[PDB]
Amino acid sequence: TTMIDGIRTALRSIGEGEISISAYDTSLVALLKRLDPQFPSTIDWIVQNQLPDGSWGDASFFMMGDRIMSTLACVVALKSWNIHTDKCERGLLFIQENMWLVGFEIALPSLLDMAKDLDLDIPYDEPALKAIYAERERKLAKIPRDVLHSMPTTLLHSLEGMVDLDWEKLLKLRCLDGSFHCSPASTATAFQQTGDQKCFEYLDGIVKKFNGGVPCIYPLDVYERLWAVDRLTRLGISRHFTSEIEDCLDYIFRNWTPDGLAHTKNCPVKDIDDTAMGFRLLRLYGYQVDPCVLKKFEKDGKFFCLHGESNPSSVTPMYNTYRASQLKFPGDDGVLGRAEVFCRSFLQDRRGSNRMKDAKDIPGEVEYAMDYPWKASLPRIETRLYLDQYGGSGDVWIGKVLHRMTLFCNDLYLKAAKADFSNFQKECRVELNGLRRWYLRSNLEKFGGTDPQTTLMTSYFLASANIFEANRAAERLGWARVALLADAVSSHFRRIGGPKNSTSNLEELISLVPFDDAYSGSLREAWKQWLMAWTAKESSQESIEGDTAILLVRAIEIFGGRHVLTGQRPDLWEYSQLEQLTSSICCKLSRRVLAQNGESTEKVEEIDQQVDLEMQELTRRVLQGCSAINRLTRETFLHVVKSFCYVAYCSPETIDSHIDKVIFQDVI
Amino acid sequence: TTTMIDGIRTALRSIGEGEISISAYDTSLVALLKPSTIDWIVQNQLPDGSDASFFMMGDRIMSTLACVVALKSWNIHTDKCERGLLFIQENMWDWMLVGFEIALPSLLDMAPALKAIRKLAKIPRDVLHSMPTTLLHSLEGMVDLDWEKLLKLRCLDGSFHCSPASTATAFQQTGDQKCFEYLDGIVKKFNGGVPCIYPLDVYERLWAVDRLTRLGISRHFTSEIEDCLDYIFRNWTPDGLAHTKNCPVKDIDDTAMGFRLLRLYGYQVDPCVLKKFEKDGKFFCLHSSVTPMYNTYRASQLKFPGDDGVLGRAEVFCRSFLQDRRGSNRMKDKWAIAKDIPGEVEYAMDYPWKASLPRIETRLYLDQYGGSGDVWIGKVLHRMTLFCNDLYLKAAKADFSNFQKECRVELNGLRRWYLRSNLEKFGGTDPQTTLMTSYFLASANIFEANRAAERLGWARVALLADAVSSHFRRIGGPKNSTSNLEELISLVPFDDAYSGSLREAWKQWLMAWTAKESSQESIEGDTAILLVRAIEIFGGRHVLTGQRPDLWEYSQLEQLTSSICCKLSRRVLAQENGESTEKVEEIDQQVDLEMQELTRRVLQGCSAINRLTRETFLHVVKSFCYVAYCSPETIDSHIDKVIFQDVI
Known part of the structure; x- marks a missing residue:
C-alpha cells in the first residue's frame, strides 16, 4: 500500500520530465562565457560525476559511444577553462586507451575539431575514426542546406557540428520554448552564434531547474505522460491512479494537433511514435480521436516516423502504431487500415530475426501484440507477461547521450505491480478452491466436461482474467458459476437431443x-x-453461444447491481444494440470453431475477416466514453466477448499454459 | 379535500386549555360581581328569550332566568329582560342536570312541578371540609360553609372543582385574590363570557385524539397527536387523571381514556392506577353511569400478561354492567347525550381486540359520530367546538371514500389477476367470494394509499396459499403431490x-406441509407466518443483523403468531364438531393469553424492531382471529358495508 501512494505522489507531481543529467550537454553549456563561466554550476556538476575509471556518462550501462563522447566533452570544458587538470587528464587516459547513437557522426567531428583547438593527446589516428568522419560528409551532403533553413527538422538537434548557417532564417524554426529541437547543446552553440534572449531563457531555466547539470533533451511533458500511462496500464495497476491518469491524459487531449504529437507540447515537428501512443491511449480511455492524423506519415504506401524526413523507421514506433491500429473503429479513415497491414508486415519480416533491436524484453512485448490481437487480449494475460518484460531500471534510451527515465522506467513500478499481482493470484487460488467445492457438492460434475476440473478451471479463469479487481469478487464468481451451469446444461442437451426430450425441471x-x-x-x-432461448433456437441451425454470452453479461450486471435506466430512449437503444452485437459476434465465432468439416482455409479466413469487422463496431460502442451507458456496463460486454473470442482463437494447450502462468506460476 | 385536513390540523396544533361553548348561567353569576358578562348576556339572548338547538326542560329555565336576576339586579336592558320572563312564566312544567336540587332552589331564593325539590341533608359536613370533593363544584346553594378549611380544597387554577359558579359565590364570602385570579383569567380568555366548567386541557385532548383515531384519520396527525398525547403522559398521576391537570379529584372517564390511548401509542403506562377506583369489587367513578364504563371496558382490552390484576377485574365487571343494560333502554347516559350510544357499545362489546379491525371499526363509527349533534351534561348544556365537530365527520367520511374508491380499483386488478392466472381451478367452488374475502382482510388492516404494494401482495400471496391448501385437501395430502408447486x-x-x-x-x-404432514398439527400457523413474511418483503423492511434482541424478539413474534393461529384453527374446528361451549371456550381463554403477549410486544413502543414490522404481526393475526370469531354471514355484511355501502 505504501508503494501505491509512492507512485501516486510521483504522478501527481508530473511535469516537464524526470530525466538523467547528460554529461555532454552539461559541459557544452559550461563553455558559455560570462555575459560581462556563465553557469559555474554546470561545472560544479561536472567535477563530481566522474566515474572511477576516469570516465563519464551513464554508469549503469557501459556503451562505447556514450562513455567516450560524454567523457571528452567534459574534458574540453575542464581544460579549456584550465581548472581541475587532475581529473582532466585522468579521464584523458580513458579516452586514449578505449578509443576502439543519435547525431553521433555530426557532433563528434565538431568535438574533435574542438579538441584540436586545445592540446590533448588523443588517438585521432584511429581506423574507426575515418569511417564515421566519412559519414560526417555522407550526411552533411544529403542534407539540403536551403531546406534545413525552411522547415523545422530533426537536424536542428545537432547544430554543434553544423557549420556556417543563416541564423536569420533559422531562429524562425525553433521550438516554442526557444530551443533548437530541444537540445541544450544545439541551443548553446546557437547562442554562441546569436544572443537571442528567448534562446538564452531556455538554457538558464534548464540549469536552474536542475541546480547545475542539464540533460540531452528537454522538455518532454508529452512523451513522459503517454509512456507512464501505457506502462502503468500494462502493469495492471492503472485502476489505482484513475484520477491522476485521467488528469494528464486530458493534457494529451489538450495538446492534440492535426499534424500529430511530438515528444513535447512545444515542438512543432511531430513523430509517429508519440502520435500512435497518444492515439491509442486517448481512444482507449474514451476520448474522441481521429486516426487521420496518421496520414501525415504515409508517403506512397509507406509509413515513416517523421513528416518528411523519410528516415529508416525503427522497431519500437511500429509496435506502437500496430497497437494503435488495433483499436480500429469502422468509421475511421482508412489510414489506420493501411497502417495495420504495413506495421504487421514490418514486425513479421523481423520476428524470425534477432533484428528486433532498437529495453529488457522487446521481442516478448511484440510476440504478444501480434499473437493476441485486441479481440483476444485479456488484461491479466498481458499483465502477467508484462511483469516478466518490464525492464525497470534496465531500460535505457538512445539519445545524444545514454539517458534514463526516472518516472516511468522505475524499480518501484515493478515492486508495486508484482505485489498487486501476487495478491491477485492468492485471492484467485482461494477463489477457485471455494469454487471447486461449489461445483462438486452440486452433483454438477456429473454434467459437463469429461474432466470437469478442466471445464471449471477455464470457466473460472476467463472470468478472473477479465474482472480481476479486488472487490469485484461478487461478479467474478457469479460469472464463473453461471458459466458452469450453462456449460453443464448445454452438455446435457447435446447428448440427449434437446429440450424436446428434457425430462427434467432444469x-x-x-x-x-x-x-x-x-x-x-x-x-x-x-x-x-x-x-427459453434453447427451445426456440432448438430445432434450427442458429447456435446458442450468442445467448450463452448474452446471459452472462446479464448476470454480471445483476451482480454488481447496476441497472440500465429504461425510460431514456437512447439508454435503451445503446443497451439493446450492444446485446445484438454480442449475440451476433459470439454466434459467428461458434461457426468458425465448427469449420475448424475442418477444411477450407479460405472459408475460415472469411469468417475471421467478418468477426473482426463486427468486433470493431462493438469496440467502438464500448469505449465511446460519451455513450449513454455506464462505463462499467460497457466493460461487461467487452469482457464477455473478449473471453469468448479468446477461447475460440486458442488451443486448449495454449489456454492453460496461460492458466498456469497467470494463476499458479507465482510472481514474487 | 386535503383542505379540511389542514383545517382540522391547525385546530389540533392550537390546542390548549379548551375550546368550549359559553354557559349563560355561569356567565350571569358574574352579574353578582362587578363587568362584561352582562354586556354578553344582553348581546346573546335567543328569539323566544333564553343553550340552543337542544331544548331541554331541566335547564332551559336557568339558561334564561339567570339572564334576568342579572339584568334586573343591576337594572339595565329590562326590555329583553321580560321578553323571556313571558317565556319562563309559561313552561314551568331521569334526564336531569348535575347539582340541580342544590343549584336551583338556591337560585329561586333571590326572586308546582318544582314543588318536589331534602337532598342536601345526605351530605357530610366534616368530609366536605377535610378532603376535596365534587360538591365543591356546586357550593352556591349551601348553608354552614366554613371557609377556613375549604380553600385547602381548591384547584391549582384557584377554582372550586373547576366551576366558575361555585367560585363566584366563594368570593362573595372571601375576597381571596388567588380565587379572583382564576375568575379574572377566565373572563379575559373568552373576551367576555364564561363556560360552566374550565379548564378542560386533559379531557379535551384525550377525547379529540380518540375521535380522530376511530375516524381512521389519525394517521394524518401522527406528529400533531403525539404532541398533545405527550402532555397527557407528562401529567399522568398515580391517582388518576382529571378533566384538567390541576384538579386534585380524579375520575375514571379521563383515566380510562388516558390509559387506553397512552398504551396504544406505545407509551409505557401502568394500569394499577385503576385500583384507586375499586371499592369492594365494584368500579365507581370517584375515590355510576354507562358511558364511562364503556371507556373503561375498551381500556381493559389492552391487557398485557404482566399487568396488575385490576384490569382483569375491570373487564369482567364492566362487561356485566353493559350486558345487564344491553337489552334495556338504560343505555341513557347521565354525563352526556349522544347520537349512537348503543352502537358504540354494541360493537365494543361484541368484537374484542383480537378481532377489532381498524377499517371495520372506522366504517361503523362514521355513522355514529354525532358531530355538533352531541351535547354534554354539566350545569348547562355545553358543546366542544373543536372535538364535537361537524368538520370532523365531513373530512373523515371523505378520505374514507377515497379508500373505497381506491379499494374498488385494486379489486379489479385482483380479479383480472386472479382469473387470467388459472387459479380459480380450485379454491373452493365459488372463488369470487374467496377472492373478495382475502382482499378484505388485507385492506381492513393495511388500508393506506401508499401501502398498496403490501395490501395487494398480501391478498395475492394469501390467495395462493388457499389455492394450494384446498388442492391439498382435495387430493389427500402432500404425500402424493402430482405437480410442481x-x-x-x-x-x-x-x-x-x-x-x-x-x-x-x-x-x-x-416445506411445512411435508414436515407437518405425517403429523396432527395444522398448518394455519405456517400460513400466517407465510403472509407476514410476504408483507415484510413487499414493504422492504429487514431486521438489523447485529442487535441480538431484535432477532430474538422477531423469532418470538413468529412463535406467537404460529401458536395463536394453530390454537385458533382448532376453536373453529372443534366448534364444528360441537364439543360443548364449556370445552371450546377453554381454548378461547387460552388464546386470549398469547394474544396479550403479542399485543404487548407490538405496543411495547421502544424495541429496536420497526413499528411497521410489529404492526404487520398484529395485522395478520388480527385478521386470522376475525375469521375464527365471526359468522360468515357477518363477514359479508362487513365487506359489503365497508367497501360497497358508499358513504357520502
Missing part, C-alpha cells in the same frame, strides 16, 4: 447459485430466458 | 426486490 438449477436478497430473483429471470 | 409464486408480478425472497418464503411454507 429451470430451477440456479438455486445452485447462493441466495442473495437482491441477486437471486433477477438471476432466475435471466436464466429462465437462456432456457 | 414451487413455481406458483411466479404468478405474483415480478419485482427485482420481492420476487427472489418471496420465492424463498413460499418454498419454506410448502
Whole structure:
C-alpha cells in the first residue's frame, strides 16, 4: 500500500520530465562565457560525476559511444577553462586507451575539431575514426542546406557540428520554448552564434531547474505522460491512479494537433511514435480521436516516423502504431487500415530475426501484440507477461547521450505491480478452491466436461482474467458459476437431443447459485430466458453461444447491481444494440470453431475477416466514453466477448499454459 | 379535500386549555360581581328569550332566568329582560342536570312541578371540609360553609372543582385574590363570557385524539397527536387523571381514556392506577353511569400478561354492567347525550381486540359520530367546538371514500389477476367470494394509499396459499403431490426486490406441509407466518443483523403468531364438531393469553424492531382471529358495508 501512494505522489507531481543529467550537454553549456563561466554550476556538476575509471556518462550501462563522447566533452570544458587538470587528464587516459547513437557522426567531428583547438593527446589516428568522419560528409551532403533553413527538422538537434548557417532564417524554426529541437547543446552553440534572449531563457531555466547539470533533451511533458500511462496500464495497476491518469491524459487531449504529437507540447515537428501512443491511449480511455492524423506519415504506401524526413523507421514506433491500429473503429479513415497491414508486415519480416533491436524484453512485448490481437487480449494475460518484460531500471534510451527515465522506467513500478499481482493470484487460488467445492457438492460434475476440473478451471479463469479487481469478487464468481451451469446444461442437451426430450425441471438449477436478497430473483429471470432461448433456437441451425454470452453479461450486471435506466430512449437503444452485437459476434465465432468439416482455409479466413469487422463496431460502442451507458456496463460486454473470442482463437494447450502462468506460476 | 385536513390540523396544533361553548348561567353569576358578562348576556339572548338547538326542560329555565336576576339586579336592558320572563312564566312544567336540587332552589331564593325539590341533608359536613370533593363544584346553594378549611380544597387554577359558579359565590364570602385570579383569567380568555366548567386541557385532548383515531384519520396527525398525547403522559398521576391537570379529584372517564390511548401509542403506562377506583369489587367513578364504563371496558382490552390484576377485574365487571343494560333502554347516559350510544357499545362489546379491525371499526363509527349533534351534561348544556365537530365527520367520511374508491380499483386488478392466472381451478367452488374475502382482510388492516404494494401482495400471496391448501385437501395430502408447486409464486408480478425472497418464503411454507404432514398439527400457523413474511418483503423492511434482541424478539413474534393461529384453527374446528361451549371456550381463554403477549410486544413502543414490522404481526393475526370469531354471514355484511355501502 505504501508503494501505491509512492507512485501516486510521483504522478501527481508530473511535469516537464524526470530525466538523467547528460554529461555532454552539461559541459557544452559550461563553455558559455560570462555575459560581462556563465553557469559555474554546470561545472560544479561536472567535477563530481566522474566515474572511477576516469570516465563519464551513464554508469549503469557501459556503451562505447556514450562513455567516450560524454567523457571528452567534459574534458574540453575542464581544460579549456584550465581548472581541475587532475581529473582532466585522468579521464584523458580513458579516452586514449578505449578509443576502439543519435547525431553521433555530426557532433563528434565538431568535438574533435574542438579538441584540436586545445592540446590533448588523443588517438585521432584511429581506423574507426575515418569511417564515421566519412559519414560526417555522407550526411552533411544529403542534407539540403536551403531546406534545413525552411522547415523545422530533426537536424536542428545537432547544430554543434553544423557549420556556417543563416541564423536569420533559422531562429524562425525553433521550438516554442526557444530551443533548437530541444537540445541544450544545439541551443548553446546557437547562442554562441546569436544572443537571442528567448534562446538564452531556455538554457538558464534548464540549469536552474536542475541546480547545475542539464540533460540531452528537454522538455518532454508529452512523451513522459503517454509512456507512464501505457506502462502503468500494462502493469495492471492503472485502476489505482484513475484520477491522476485521467488528469494528464486530458493534457494529451489538450495538446492534440492535426499534424500529430511530438515528444513535447512545444515542438512543432511531430513523430509517429508519440502520435500512435497518444492515439491509442486517448481512444482507449474514451476520448474522441481521429486516426487521420496518421496520414501525415504515409508517403506512397509507406509509413515513416517523421513528416518528411523519410528516415529508416525503427522497431519500437511500429509496435506502437500496430497497437494503435488495433483499436480500429469502422468509421475511421482508412489510414489506420493501411497502417495495420504495413506495421504487421514490418514486425513479421523481423520476428524470425534477432533484428528486433532498437529495453529488457522487446521481442516478448511484440510476440504478444501480434499473437493476441485486441479481440483476444485479456488484461491479466498481458499483465502477467508484462511483469516478466518490464525492464525497470534496465531500460535505457538512445539519445545524444545514454539517458534514463526516472518516472516511468522505475524499480518501484515493478515492486508495486508484482505485489498487486501476487495478491491477485492468492485471492484467485482461494477463489477457485471455494469454487471447486461449489461445483462438486452440486452433483454438477456429473454434467459437463469429461474432466470437469478442466471445464471449471477455464470457466473460472476467463472470468478472473477479465474482472480481476479486488472487490469485484461478487461478479467474478457469479460469472464463473453461471458459466458452469450453462456449460453443464448445454452438455446435457447435446447428448440427449434437446429440450424436446428434457425430462427434467432444469429451470430451477440456479438455486445452485447462493441466495442473495437482491441477486437471486433477477438471476432466475435471466436464466429462465437462456432456457427459453434453447427451445426456440432448438430445432434450427442458429447456435446458442450468442445467448450463452448474452446471459452472462446479464448476470454480471445483476451482480454488481447496476441497472440500465429504461425510460431514456437512447439508454435503451445503446443497451439493446450492444446485446445484438454480442449475440451476433459470439454466434459467428461458434461457426468458425465448427469449420475448424475442418477444411477450407479460405472459408475460415472469411469468417475471421467478418468477426473482426463486427468486433470493431462493438469496440467502438464500448469505449465511446460519451455513450449513454455506464462505463462499467460497457466493460461487461467487452469482457464477455473478449473471453469468448479468446477461447475460440486458442488451443486448449495454449489456454492453460496461460492458466498456469497467470494463476499458479507465482510472481514474487 | 386535503383542505379540511389542514383545517382540522391547525385546530389540533392550537390546542390548549379548551375550546368550549359559553354557559349563560355561569356567565350571569358574574352579574353578582362587578363587568362584561352582562354586556354578553344582553348581546346573546335567543328569539323566544333564553343553550340552543337542544331544548331541554331541566335547564332551559336557568339558561334564561339567570339572564334576568342579572339584568334586573343591576337594572339595565329590562326590555329583553321580560321578553323571556313571558317565556319562563309559561313552561314551568331521569334526564336531569348535575347539582340541580342544590343549584336551583338556591337560585329561586333571590326572586308546582318544582314543588318536589331534602337532598342536601345526605351530605357530610366534616368530609366536605377535610378532603376535596365534587360538591365543591356546586357550593352556591349551601348553608354552614366554613371557609377556613375549604380553600385547602381548591384547584391549582384557584377554582372550586373547576366551576366558575361555585367560585363566584366563594368570593362573595372571601375576597381571596388567588380565587379572583382564576375568575379574572377566565373572563379575559373568552373576551367576555364564561363556560360552566374550565379548564378542560386533559379531557379535551384525550377525547379529540380518540375521535380522530376511530375516524381512521389519525394517521394524518401522527406528529400533531403525539404532541398533545405527550402532555397527557407528562401529567399522568398515580391517582388518576382529571378533566384538567390541576384538579386534585380524579375520575375514571379521563383515566380510562388516558390509559387506553397512552398504551396504544406505545407509551409505557401502568394500569394499577385503576385500583384507586375499586371499592369492594365494584368500579365507581370517584375515590355510576354507562358511558364511562364503556371507556373503561375498551381500556381493559389492552391487557398485557404482566399487568396488575385490576384490569382483569375491570373487564369482567364492566362487561356485566353493559350486558345487564344491553337489552334495556338504560343505555341513557347521565354525563352526556349522544347520537349512537348503543352502537358504540354494541360493537365494543361484541368484537374484542383480537378481532377489532381498524377499517371495520372506522366504517361503523362514521355513522355514529354525532358531530355538533352531541351535547354534554354539566350545569348547562355545553358543546366542544373543536372535538364535537361537524368538520370532523365531513373530512373523515371523505378520505374514507377515497379508500373505497381506491379499494374498488385494486379489486379489479385482483380479479383480472386472479382469473387470467388459472387459479380459480380450485379454491373452493365459488372463488369470487374467496377472492373478495382475502382482499378484505388485507385492506381492513393495511388500508393506506401508499401501502398498496403490501395490501395487494398480501391478498395475492394469501390467495395462493388457499389455492394450494384446498388442492391439498382435495387430493389427500402432500404425500402424493402430482405437480410442481414451487413455481406458483411466479404468478405474483415480478419485482427485482420481492420476487427472489418471496420465492424463498413460499418454498419454506410448502416445506411445512411435508414436515407437518405425517403429523396432527395444522398448518394455519405456517400460513400466517407465510403472509407476514410476504408483507415484510413487499414493504422492504429487514431486521438489523447485529442487535441480538431484535432477532430474538422477531423469532418470538413468529412463535406467537404460529401458536395463536394453530390454537385458533382448532376453536373453529372443534366448534364444528360441537364439543360443548364449556370445552371450546377453554381454548378461547387460552388464546386470549398469547394474544396479550403479542399485543404487548407490538405496543411495547421502544424495541429496536420497526413499528411497521410489529404492526404487520398484529395485522395478520388480527385478521386470522376475525375469521375464527365471526359468522360468515357477518363477514359479508362487513365487506359489503365497508367497501360497497358508499358513504357520502
